[PDB]
C-alpha cells in the first residue's frame, strides 16, 4: 500500500525537507540539535528537534505488517570537564507534535508522569 525511504549523509544549511524546532540547526554539514556558543561550545537549557517533512503511515484498518528501520550516526561530545547533559533521542510522534521542555526531558515530554 505504501513505502517511504529516505537517506541523509550530510546536512545542507537550507534543508527544505526537514522541520526545525528549537535551537536545532545545521552547519559544517552536521545537525546541531542543541544551541551553540559562538565559539563552538555547548550551552545550557537548550532544546532542538528535527522532523522529516513527509508524514508516515504507521497503520491502517485492513493492513497487516508495518515495519521500519533507521540507522543514526550521532556524536555526543563536550569540551568541558563537568558532567554532560542531557540526552539524544529518536522519536515518532503525531505530525503536529511540537518541542517540549528541555533538561532530562529531551524536548519530548512536559512533566514526568
Amino acid at each position: 500500500a505504501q513505502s517511504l525511504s529516505f537517506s541523509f549523509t550530510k546536512f545542507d544549511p537550507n534543508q527544505e525537507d526537514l522541520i526545525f524546532q528549537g535551537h536545532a540547526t545545521s552547519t559544517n554539514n552536521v545537525l546541531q540539535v542543541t544551541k551553540l556558543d559562538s565559539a563552538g561550545n555547548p550551552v545550557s537549557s537548550s532544546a532542538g528537534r528535527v522532523l522529516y517533512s513527509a508524514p508516515l503511515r504507521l497503520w491502517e484498518d485492513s493492513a497487516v505488517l508495518t515495519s521500519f528501520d533507521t540507522i543514526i550516526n550521532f556524536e555526543i561530545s563536550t569540551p568541558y570537564t563537568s558532567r554532560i547533559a542531557d540526552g539524544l533521542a529518536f522519536f515518532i510522534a503525531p505530525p503536529d507534535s511540537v518541542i517540549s521542555y528541555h533538561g532530562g526531558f529531551l524536548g519530548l515530554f512536559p512533566n514526568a508522569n
Binding site: 505504501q2 549523509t9 542543541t34 522529516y52 561530545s77 563536550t78 532530562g104
Partner: protein, 117 residues
Amino acid sequence: SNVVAVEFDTYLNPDYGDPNYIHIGIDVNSIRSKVTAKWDWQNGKIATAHISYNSVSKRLSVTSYYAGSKPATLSYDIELHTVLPEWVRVGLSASTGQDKERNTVHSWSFTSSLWTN
C-alpha cells in the same frame, strides 16, 4: 503528551526514573522508560544506532555501537498502533539544562514499509 522514543541518556534523573548510569531507553508516552540498558557513552567518537520495528514480531529493538567496542542492545515488545495514531512524523531530538553537551547528528537513514489487504 503522545510519543514513542528511543533515548540515549547521559544525565541521570532518579526522580524521573533514570537508573544510576549512562543508559539507552525505550519510552512509551513517558520519560519514565519502560525498559532500560547500560550504554557505554564515549566523548568525541561517533555512534551508530539501528532501531527496528515489526508489527508481527510485536518487537521494537535497538543496537548501538561505537566502532571498535561492544554494542548495547535493548528490546521491548509493543504493538505501536495502539500507542500511536495512524499518521506520524519521525524525528531526532536532543536537549540540555543546567549541564551541557554537544548534540550533533551526522548521517541519518530511515526506511519504512506498510502492507495492507
